[PDB]
Every structure is written in structure tokens, then in C-alpha cells.
Symmetry: D2
């Protein structure tokens, strides 16, 4: 259910393949921030989720360097996939920028992204 | 400097290889929680960091399923590598469990782990 | 604007008064968790926000002890009030439970609540 | 009662607090970093009947970063627990939200962790 194209509330595009082995691989294109075009992502998901009606835990990382620019930053998304008619991936994320030690207190943004199969 | 065996303040063991393509690959073994033995990890890091004294941004994911146990959960660590005489990786993390829709409000733990190469 | 009765996406009820010099005071009633009835809250907000369309920063705390039970925990909400035709308070929160040192790694839940004045 | 007094975190900030019998926290905060000058009002709450099994005492407080000297249009909340004894600490995680346009709301919130000691 996870493999495919997903869109969050910002209009970013998350292209992912879920491997039989628990791997997530794909590309991420952000609608905002110091980013242009596609970035590599890799992550992991629970390939044998609970028998009951529970979400499928997952996470992935983008480092914001590609052939066009380098923001010296990385975002990790941690969340769960929920299938069905209005399938969603509900996430919280941490975006860490490379900082000097003096500025490390302000290195990390936190937020939440909800991904759907429709824009 | 990222490639190696790292330990956090809980005693967990993070074995990682940093590839020239920006990939992080390896295994994680937690000293705590619903976990036993090693788990696959994958992540990304900035392969061309700033040269101005800033750390190197990175992130990785563990889904807590292996051949022995499945916690139906995933952790993402977002942080930066700080080089020096005593290299360190400073992270914040998000641990999401698969939940029902009604219990989604309590799906995600947050914390912070600091890693060094001192066993 | 901020003063009023607010409800989040869980159906929890946030009754707050914004004071002239930056105080937030009121009661919180959670629809979920180890909680029943109302709890005291206190917080702070920016009483002189920007006038450029930016939201109004604010935050508050609940310790989850009242006359009926005590969860040995506290939540803080950090967020901003967004004025307009549909007033909204958008927050992220941290819920810390009192733990032993050995369990401190799992002391804190994180989430996000959005509040409106629409009664469920 | 162990909460009442002057605390310092790892940044050099000073946290001056009084714990009321009813569960109130009141005092002042002076940050060593950020868009901040002199003391700011804080208010918060703590568990005034904590467990007696060696667990910490849950607490939180808020600073809005306006005082008579300046206004950063931001607020921080600290959520954590007090741990007593010879090496007393208040261990926290925090969320700092800046007032933003809706277009920039995705980057409104910084997250971190502060450890307060009596020294
Ligand atoms: O500005 C940067 O340093 C890189 C781009 C950051 C984009 C963030 S990642 C979290 C949030 N979700 C998105 O789809 N975009 C932003
Ligand atoms: O309990 C689970 O659901 C799986 C084990 C989680 C262990 C967490 S991940 C964050 C923290 N850092 C560690 O080294 N262990 C814990
Ligand atoms: O279970 C507890 O320890 C006390 C109740 C916590 C309820 C939380 S606070 C964050 C979220 N928002 C709500 O309205 N309820 C939950
Ligand atoms: O820059 C601002 O908007 C106001 C100052 C923020 C200071 C933060 S609060 C979290 C962290 N802990 C501190 O003691 N200072 C910083």
C-alpha cells in the first residue's frame, strides 16, 4: 500500500518504493525551503504490521544535497501509514541544519506532515 | 569520520558505514525497549559539509522488526556529526509506534541521544 | 481574540483568558489519556504581536493533577494564534511523565493539536 | 520544595522559579542566547503530589519573549521533570514557536533539550 506517489499539505511530492525486506527508497521534492528538484531518500518500514487495525510504522531521511544545491541539512520523518479509502501517511519530522557548536541550540526544526494519495 | 562503531548514553550500539554517495548503512542494537539483537538501519548524510566549523547534518531510521522480534515501531534520528579529537554525533529522535486512529495522539516519543566512539 | 472556549481535533476543551500583560489562565479538559474533568492551566502570550500578518506566539502548561486523579505528568503546548474569518490556534506539544532515571528515555510524548472555537 | 530557587542550564541561561503549594510555577528566565535581553516572566505548573518511588516530578513552563526591553514575537515552552538528591536536576525538552505568516508556518518551531542544575 505504501509504494507510490504521495503529497503533503505543503504540496511536496514523496515518491517511494517499499521493498519486501523493509526498505524505503525513492525521491523527495519539497514545495518549500532551501530545495529544488528531487532528493534521494532512504528509510525503513514495518513489513509485518499488527494483525489488528493499527498503522504501519515507518521513517525516512532526506539529506538536502543534490546536483543543484546543498542546504547543509537533513530531515527525518517518523510516522505511520494508514491504508483504506483515504489512505494517509501521518508524520512528525525533525530538520537538523549543520551548525557551529555555539549555535547548536537552534539547529533543529520540528513539524508534522500529512501525506495523501491526492494533492 | 562517521564510519565506525558508536555508542550512546544508554549503551546502545550504532554500527554505520558512510558511503561516498551520501548513504548511511549499518545496524543498531538498543540497550532499552522492546528490542533484541541487531536491526537494519539506513540513512543519509551531507557528503559535502560546510568548511566553516559547522557540523555535518545526517539522519537515519530503524524499523524495530528483525528475525527475533517486532515492536511495530520505528525510530528516526536527526542530528549532526561533530568532528574533532573527540568526535560526537548529537541527535534528537522520534519513535513512532503503529496505533489505532483513536490512539494516534500518543503514537510518538521524542528524545535525544549523543553518540561517541568510546565503548 | 485568544480569550474564549476552544476545542481541538480530539474534542478536548481549552477555556482561556488572555490578560493585558501577557498572562494566559484557564482550564483544560482532555478527551483522551489518564485524565478526567478540568485541570488548571497557566501560560504566556505575546501581547504586542507583529502587524505584518504573522501569528501571535503563545504557550501554556497543564500538570495532570486535580481533585479526581493524578497522572504524574505535564503537557506544554507551544504555538501561535492565527486570527481571521476562522480563528485557529496551531500547536505542538510535549507531554512528560515523571519516570525513574532508567526509564527517562521514554518519558516524553510529542504531538500537535489544532484548536478552533467550533463546538464538536 | 526542591524546585524553588535558581537554576542554570548548559547554555548559561538562568531560571529563577518559585513552586507554590497548589502546583503553580512563577518566576523569571534570562537566556544566554537568542533574541533576548534581561529577564522575562515565566509561568507554569508542576505535580505537587509526585510519586514517592524515586520517579521525577513532572513540570512545564512558558516564556513569551517580550519584556520592557524588546519583543522577539516568540514563545518557548519547557516540558520535563525535576529529580532531587545530591546532584539535583531539571531535565527538559522545549519547543520555541515564532509568530509566522501561514506560508512560513512549516518552519515556525525549534525543538531542543535543556538540562538545569543548581550549579
Ligand atoms: O530548507 C532546507 O534546509 C531544506 C528543505 C526543507 C523542507 C522541509 S522538510 C519538512 C517540511 N516538509 C516538506 O515537504 N518540506 C519541509
Ligand atoms: O521499544 C521499541 O518500540 C523499540 C526500541 C526503541 C529504543 C529507543 S530508540 C530511541 C532510544 N535510543 C536508544 O538507543 N534506544 C531508545
Ligand atoms: O495521560 C496523561 O498523562 C494526561 C492526559 C494527557 C492528554 C494529552 S495532552 C496532549 C494531547 N492533547 C489533548 O487534548 N490530550 C492529549
Ligand atoms: O530568540 C528568541 O526568539 C528568544 C530567545 C530563545 C532562547 C531559547 S529558549 C530555548 C533555549 N534555552 C535557552 O536557555 N535559550 C534558548
Amino acid at each position: 500500500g505504501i509504494t507510490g506517489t504521495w503529497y503533503n499539505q505543503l504540496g511536496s511530492t514523496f515518491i517511494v518504493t517499499a521493498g519486501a525486506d523493509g526498505a524505503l527508497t525513492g525521491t523527495y521534492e519539497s514545495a518549500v525551503g532551501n530545495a529544488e528538484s528531487r532528493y534521494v531518500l532512504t528509510g525503513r518500514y514495518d513489513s509485518a504490521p499488527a494483525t489488528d487495525g493499527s498503522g504501519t510504522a515507518l521513517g525516512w531521511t532526506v539529506a538536502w544535497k543534490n546536483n543543484y544545491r546543498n542546504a547543509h541539512s537533513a530531515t527525518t520523518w517518523s510516522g505511520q501509514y494508514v491504508g483504506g479509502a483515504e489512505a494517509r501517511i501521518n508524520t512528525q519530522w525533525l530538520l537538523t541544519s549543520g551548525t557551529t557548536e555555539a549555535n547548536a541550540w537552534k539547529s533543529t526544526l520540528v513539524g508534522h506532515d500529512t501525506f495523501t494519495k491526492v494533492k
